[PDB]
Amino acid sequence: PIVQNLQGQMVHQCISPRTLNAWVKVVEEKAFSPEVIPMFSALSCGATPQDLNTMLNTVGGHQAAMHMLKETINEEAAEWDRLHPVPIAPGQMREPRGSDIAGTTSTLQEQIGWMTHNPPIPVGEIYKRWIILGLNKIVRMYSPTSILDIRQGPKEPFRDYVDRFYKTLRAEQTETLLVQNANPDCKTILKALGPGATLEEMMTACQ
Amino acid sequence: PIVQNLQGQMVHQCISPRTLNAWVKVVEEKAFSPEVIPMFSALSCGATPQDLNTMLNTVGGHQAAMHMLKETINEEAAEWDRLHPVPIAPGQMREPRGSDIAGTTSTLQEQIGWMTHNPPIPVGEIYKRWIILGLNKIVRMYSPTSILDIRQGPKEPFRDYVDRFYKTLRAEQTETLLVQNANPDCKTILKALGPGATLEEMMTACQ
Amino acid sequence: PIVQNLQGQMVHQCISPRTLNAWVKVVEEKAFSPEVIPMFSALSCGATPQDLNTMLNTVGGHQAAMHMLKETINEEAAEWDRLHPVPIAPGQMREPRGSDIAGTTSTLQEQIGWMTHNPPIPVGEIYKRWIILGLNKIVRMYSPTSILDIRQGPKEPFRDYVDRFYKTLRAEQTETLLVQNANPDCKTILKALGPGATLEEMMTACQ
């Protein structure tokens, strides 16, 4: 990543073995659960496009998703080229192309040059926004259960039902559907509460 | 987080893989036990609102609690706006809104600017206080057993009973109830001790 | 903790995830064995009162001991107030109270101010001494076996017996009792050695 040293200047740092292993492990354990996306964003703090491509390529398996990611990246790369239509002088920064932001036609020194410019061209943050966009579309598609099928069981604790409800809702990307899909006993209690009840009040009443 | 370097200036640091993994793991293992809250506070030392949102979003599951957390955060964010009613000049700090402190309408550079100002606007500590408030309400609600039902067994060691008693009491958020819920043999000993006995004296007498 | 940087000045550092996890784990594995106390002291090197309270609060369970710890802390806090009886000027250090040293009525900035003063008021070391005092009283009470009941078995190796003997003695908080509680065969050998024998000589003779 590009990180500021202990003297106030932005310099390049090698991606750490702890960072590399943490990203690989979370994909192995959680696949494309919704909480994997913020983990990717945190673990790629200050990452260059090269670092972002590194993280994606260390993922073995889920290659269907990785190809969807490339398609989303190319869509965003093509949009950037339509919003930013371009001899380049000696020793002198060039504007980046979509494929430059994606790290495919640009060198690390070029990415360092853009990201540390004054003002900086944050090709890493632009690329990361493309990746998260594509990652979120994967999260929705891999969500196994629709919110319409999350209904509280006749003996299911309300707490467990709300857990499944909003876990599903988070991947699908509320309060009245949560009441409608509650079981008959709790749904009866939740209507007596009236409108405007908080989740805390609702869960307390069906305890 | 925002941490001071080895030269005496406050700069931004990327949240570490060790920090990210430590928060995720403790939630996986302890859920919303009372001791999870001080762990969250320590692991979020110097955190920005972005870092605080990062930590919350890496939690998979317990999504019912996370939605209660959002409701508490919005309540505190709405209160801040009622206590701090607001053209913004070029290059110049703006007062934060409730959603700015919660990291939803503010950028990282803006959060860095507030937290490192002189005097600093500690939007991270303000947000953290909101989160801990909401986290504590979750701890009370998820406490499975009431203090009224913690009574020493006829053969239960007094040490084990006091452990369960104050473990329950900590989540519920004393000395006379501890005597009343003791078993007949120990309760007899504890009355002979008289008032003002310490916990050490009480546990010694029923050993 | 408060640690000196690489330039010779005392500044605040966030308690590390490795430190937090190491304290939690040792309590989970060893409870209140005697060797847990020096581990707590080492892991709290340079800790502020806030850091000391952090470490105590990350302990889940053993809540009976934690309440005994609070009682000991309040006793020491009350003593400090009796030994140090107190408008506070603008921007100007105030003497600490017992509850200030215990981190309950003092801010982190105040604790940093005391600990880094010239001369420093080591509220962290004062608090730590209170905690270790209370922790040691827990170690004695949780010692399951009295030294009077540690006697060498008729076929127990002398090495194993001495291990149990001084393990028990360490928690209870010597040489002649070790001879008296030895088995008949070894006790006969140990009297023939005479007075003033070292532990090495004693263990060698009963090998």
Added chain:
Amino acid sequence: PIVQNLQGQMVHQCISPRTLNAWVKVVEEKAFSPEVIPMFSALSCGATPQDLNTMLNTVGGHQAAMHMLKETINEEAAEWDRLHPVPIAPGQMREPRGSDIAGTTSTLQEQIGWMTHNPPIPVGEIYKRWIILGLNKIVRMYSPTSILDIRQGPKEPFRDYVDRFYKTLRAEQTETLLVQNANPDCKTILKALGPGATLEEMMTACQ
């Protein structure tokens, strides 16, 4: 590796135990899966030829591949000598040979001298490009299944089939073959979609 300190100068650093162990472990677990190559590239960030040889030599087993790697390295080393045909003055940098870039006839001080020169001779990056070239040829040869034999099962979820398809394709080093190898039911749906369908659209239709 050669890394810039916190003062802006490139100096030598010892390869870390975390780096050494991370490379060994990934080879033990994944052998020559395609994602092992980007892991090698990231873990060898800023590596000298000595560091690159270190990483290769810590690999136990897969010695057939390591000998293929040497053959590829010698081929690239011989090419470099044909593109760069060479008394060397006292204290004065010499041009490198193919075996110098491969770390076999050059010292660490010589590699440091080339890599930190102005302008730098990046013998580490040149060597790394040779290694990755040879590593990729191993990935293709060790790919067990050909893309022609990746066909969706009659009850295999389309997602799982695309995973295997592009996993195989990645090692072999698309969209119309993916349709042809789909099962009859899904292939019927995919033709109705028409040309130019994205992977996301294709996977959605066969869900």
Added chain:
Amino acid sequence: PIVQNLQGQMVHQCISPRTLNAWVKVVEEKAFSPEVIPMFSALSCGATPQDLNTMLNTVGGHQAAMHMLKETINEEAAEWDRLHPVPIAPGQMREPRGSDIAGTTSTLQEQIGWMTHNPPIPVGEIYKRWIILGLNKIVRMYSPTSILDIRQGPKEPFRDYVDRFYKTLRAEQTETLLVQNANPDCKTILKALGPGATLEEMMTACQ
């Protein structure tokens, strides 16, 4: 420990959680095997007497050995007082006593003052030499098997026998006894080799 910063001055550093855990773990796994002593010496690099006492006190169990260690320490402390017989002026270093070097009557600031003096009084290295002396006496006593009882089996590989032979010899604290305790077949071969054979030659001949 006392370690030099990145600016060339000796300052105090808190003993690390990795150091504390590494010492505890090696004692748990290897007890008082001979190789535990050099591990203790390496892990206590630059340690103060306080750090050395910390490491000893984190050891749970083996309390018989720890009491032998104290007896050896007191013997060396008494010797130092006999070799170094002693108003102390304000703000001014005092010569250390045996108990000062052992960390029992001296503060950390005093130990820092001695160790960083010019010229330095290395109370840490003096104490460490006392500890290693006592630790080595424990290694000899806990050696279970005498060298006289290490004899090669009639079908035992010579390599395995030499391993046990010098493992035992290392704890007991050679070449002709190794031949005498070899089995008849190998002993016959080893006499034909003649005097002055290396261990490599000896092991080769009995392979």
Added chain:
Amino acid sequence: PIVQNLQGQMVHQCISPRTLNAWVKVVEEKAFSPEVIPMFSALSCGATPQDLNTMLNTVGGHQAAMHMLKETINEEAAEWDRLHPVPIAPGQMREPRGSDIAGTTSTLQEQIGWMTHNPPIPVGEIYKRWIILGLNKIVRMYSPTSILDIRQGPKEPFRDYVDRFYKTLRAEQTETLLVQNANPDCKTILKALGPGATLEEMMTACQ
């Protein structure tokens, strides 16, 4: 080890717990496999003779090999004394002896003085070369199988056979013997290939 700080000067650093544990673990898991030697060389980057002796002494077991190592070290130490035959002035570097390079008659300060001299006397690298020499002789002797006995099985995959072939060859310290020891079916194919075939071509043909 001796490592350069972040200011460009060579200073002493304590051997890290990660380094110590990594060397011990690899010996426990791999014994004297060929790849253990480059691991030792990397983990001893910049090591002093004291650090090199530390690493050897933390190895428990394999004491036969460690005694062969001492014999090789003494041989190299005796050679150095024959190539470098020696009042030493106050405060003034002395030439090292063989036992000085091996760390047996020299202090750490003396080793630091030699290694950081201008020009430096690299007693650590000289000692390390002695150790690796002796370690390699152990690798050859502990190789269980000779290359003459590595022959491809009638149903053994050629890839697996080449793996065993060069694994054995690496420890023993090629292309025509690999053909001769192939099975009849593959050997027939390999002769049809003709001379000068690469390993990649050979393995491809027998696939």
